[PDB]
């Protein structure tokens, strides 16, 4: 992906994080587990929801064909009518298919971005109080108990304290 | 002791297309095209049609 996180330096996703799209896995002396970053997650849900509704709604006004009939000596205008109706169907078919392709690409990249930013958010808190392992993980120099871990997820990680 | 960043995966086989890649497996997708019909001529909002038959 464009942002290098998903299927990049973070090799794979987590079956074990069920509760959100992005989040944290912690590991210390007390144990280990997954925790979803709900805010980043809810941001993503609002964006994707709006997108879908934007797509659905933009295609709201669109060409509606009507039945028109013509006799045996009106072949020219019958052909015109047919070319006209087919022409608009092809145009709207193109618009729909291309919009889906373009916005699918942007949706996948959007998720990649949200992950990259969540990773950097944590990196920028910890700074040189942890080893950046290069795989999505940060190994602490100090012991980091569950409250310590929570403060990382908080945005509250007190850097001067360590 | 360590903390790691990651993302959701699941058992989904739903696929979507993009410009640069086709058949990308995603965790979730939403179909927006109705493909089926009941194969019958019906009352429209309760008001029966005029069926001229032959």
């Amino acid at each position, epitope marked *: 992906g464009l942002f290098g996180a998903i299927a990049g330096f973070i090799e794979g996703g987590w*079956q074990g994080m*069920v*509760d959100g799209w992005y989040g944290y896995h912690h590991s210390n002396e007390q144990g280990s587990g997954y925790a979803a970053d709900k805010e980043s997650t809810q941001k993503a849900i609002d964006g*994707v929801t709006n997108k879908v509704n934007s797509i659905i709604d933009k295609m709201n006004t669109q060409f509606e064909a009507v039945g028109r009939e013509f006799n045996n000596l009106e072949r020219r205008i019958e052909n015109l009518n047919k070319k006209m109706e087919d022409g608009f169907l092809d145009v709207w078919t193109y618009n729909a298919e291309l919009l889906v392709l373009m916005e699918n690409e942007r949706t996948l990249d959007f998720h990649d971005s949200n992950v990259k930013n969540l990773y950097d958010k944590v990196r920028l808190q910890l700074r040189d109080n942890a080893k950046e392992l290069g795989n999505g993980c940060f190994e602490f120099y100090h012991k980091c108990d569950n409250e310590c871990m929570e403060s990382v997820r908080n945005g509250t990680y007190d850097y001067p304290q360590y | 002791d360590q903390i790691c960043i990651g993302y959701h995966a699941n058992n989904s086989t739903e696929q979507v297309d993009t410009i640069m890649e086709k058949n990308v497996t995603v965790t979730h997708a939403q179909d927006i095209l109705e493909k089926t019909h009941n194969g019958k001529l019906c009352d429209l909002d309760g008001v029966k049609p005029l069926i001229l038959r032959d």
Partner: antibody
Amino acid sequence: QVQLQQSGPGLVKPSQTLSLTCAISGDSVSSYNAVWNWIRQSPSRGLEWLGRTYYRSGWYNDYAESVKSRITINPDTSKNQFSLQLNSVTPEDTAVYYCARSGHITVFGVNVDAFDMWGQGTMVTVSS
Amino acid sequence: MTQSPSSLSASVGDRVTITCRTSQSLSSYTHWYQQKPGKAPKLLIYAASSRGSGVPSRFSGSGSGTDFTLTISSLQPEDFATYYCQQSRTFGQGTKVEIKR
């Protein structure tokens, strides 16, 4: 429709182990679109989520911080049930215990922890 | 999660609104339950505003930032209950709706 049928004794002596079972019908304990939870309720403490188990290419458990050192929740894929075990009970563990399914209803495939089906409840009294 | 009021009396046909102020605002995680005495809770609303299966149209939910609301447009006798809001694994304390004389 999914039904959850609870069982287990409603009387536990102090310091001993509370043991409950939830038997599932209409769904699989190992379903990818289910999460299996225990929640308790007491007049004092209100509604309290205790823990869960679920299967996603392997079994996972999460437990509430308040009970983490005493609690075990195990699936049984032979009998399509899951259990609650709570060790070293005290009077404060007196409550109605409910099993409940979550993650059946998801926003964009993400379990939001919205419980959609609950068992009937087992009233548990800690007393000698 | 803080619910207000902790209880209320309203007559049949009344418009009823209950509020939950959450620690932090997420629309998708918030949910509402209705519990009648001695029964399990029933899911009423999920993700702030989606009606649960089999839940009648008089119930709706709204969310703005950290404030979430459940509204019963026209109270019926059967809506005597305690209503709870919830996010992630945290519940509000509940609101008792009694049917006021």
